[PDB]
Amino acid sequence: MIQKTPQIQVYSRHPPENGKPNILNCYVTQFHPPHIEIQMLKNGKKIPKVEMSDMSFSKDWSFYILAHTEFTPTETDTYACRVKHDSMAEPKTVYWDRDM
Amino acid sequence: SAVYNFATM
Amino acid sequence: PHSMRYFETAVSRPGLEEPRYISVGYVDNKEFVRFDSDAENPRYEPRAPWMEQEGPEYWERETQKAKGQEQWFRVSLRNLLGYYNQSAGGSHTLQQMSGCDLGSDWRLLRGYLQFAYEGRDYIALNEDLKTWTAADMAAQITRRKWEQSGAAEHYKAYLEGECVEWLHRYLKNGNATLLRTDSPKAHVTHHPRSKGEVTLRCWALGFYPADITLTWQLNGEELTQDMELVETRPAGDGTFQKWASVVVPLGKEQNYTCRVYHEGLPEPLTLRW
Fold first, then answer.
1. Are the CB atoms for C93 and C8 separated by under 8 Å?
2. Who contacts A75 (Cβ-Cβ below 8 Å, separation ≥6)?
3. Backbone angles phi and psi of C269, in degrees to 5
4. Neighbours of chain B (3+ CB pairs under 8 A)
5. Which chain B residues have a beta carbon less than 8 Å from that of C65?
6. What architecture does CATH give domain C1-179?
7. What's the Rg (C-alpha) of chain C?
8. For residue C173, what is the enclosing H or E element?
9. Which fold would CATH assign to domain A1-100?
10. Nearest CB to C95: which of A4, A54, A61?
11. Domain C180-270 belongs to what architecture?
12. Burial C43-57 (b: 16+ CB within 10 A, else e)
């Protein structure tokens, strides 16, 4: 009675280059209340120092935000974004897909 | 320039 | 078709901490100012290079206004808990959108002053800048309250005055920046996502502003009968990205064309796998 289901989009800023550095982004959107917990996983393992952008909200009142951190793709090194919001009965975890 | 609200709600 | 807007937010969580107040200002959908009570030194801050033309006295004056809005919000937030007979135990959000629209002739076209509680419309100043529209029983209390104190004339004064005056100023110092663009650098990817079927993805990267349009079309009418199109998204560096793909029968991939529409681009872009 104070919320709306968050939308997640995980992706690198620069086209993914094995070994080559890169910034992983987790764009969370369409949520409300503006209380949200976002984590970036590296093989299920929480990634420290994960930058949170400044929050903002659309004319439909929902809020959006950009969580992000430096990473590096690599054939089998799996990444992800995990979100918990008082609008979903359980945290949503979406995995990165270099082709998206 | 930012708005300055009047009577509270 | 310029415009100015202040998106303010107040949120309360259980604890000894006063609610968090956030105000983001916009000139033509571009963030130019911002205040966050959660900062070490709460003060409105430049978010566009053209705003550094303003002096110290401007930033103080605005920071003081923020300070007062913060109290107005934390106070209002409490009145609403009352109106709604809510339990002081969870969290609550109070939002406001304020500003004004201008025509390219610098002429005011409309004023805006509306509020939301828990993400749902609450009370709004009608376009006549005189009457109110209240969403529910609680809002009826605020409506009555703002009618007797003559609140509208006040916001009305901001909307037809300050809002219009200062928006002219920014547009004047910031037209230089505002009119800038960053052309999208498109390209197409090939993904074996099937057998006897493949997925082509058109990409638009590093573009700005966020406005942009991507299309697919196997020469002839366009394709929306199997085209996926993600929401435009920020790169993190100030520009944005976006893509759209379509399933195609393996071996015809090269026969589909992608068109990218952006205004930083001298003309529409056409691309093939």
1. no
2. A18
3. -100, 140
4. C
5. 2-4
6. 2-Layer Sandwich (3.30)
7. 24
8. helix C163-178
9. Immunoglobulin-like (2.60.40)
10. A61
11. Sandwich (2.60)
12. bbbebbebbeebeee
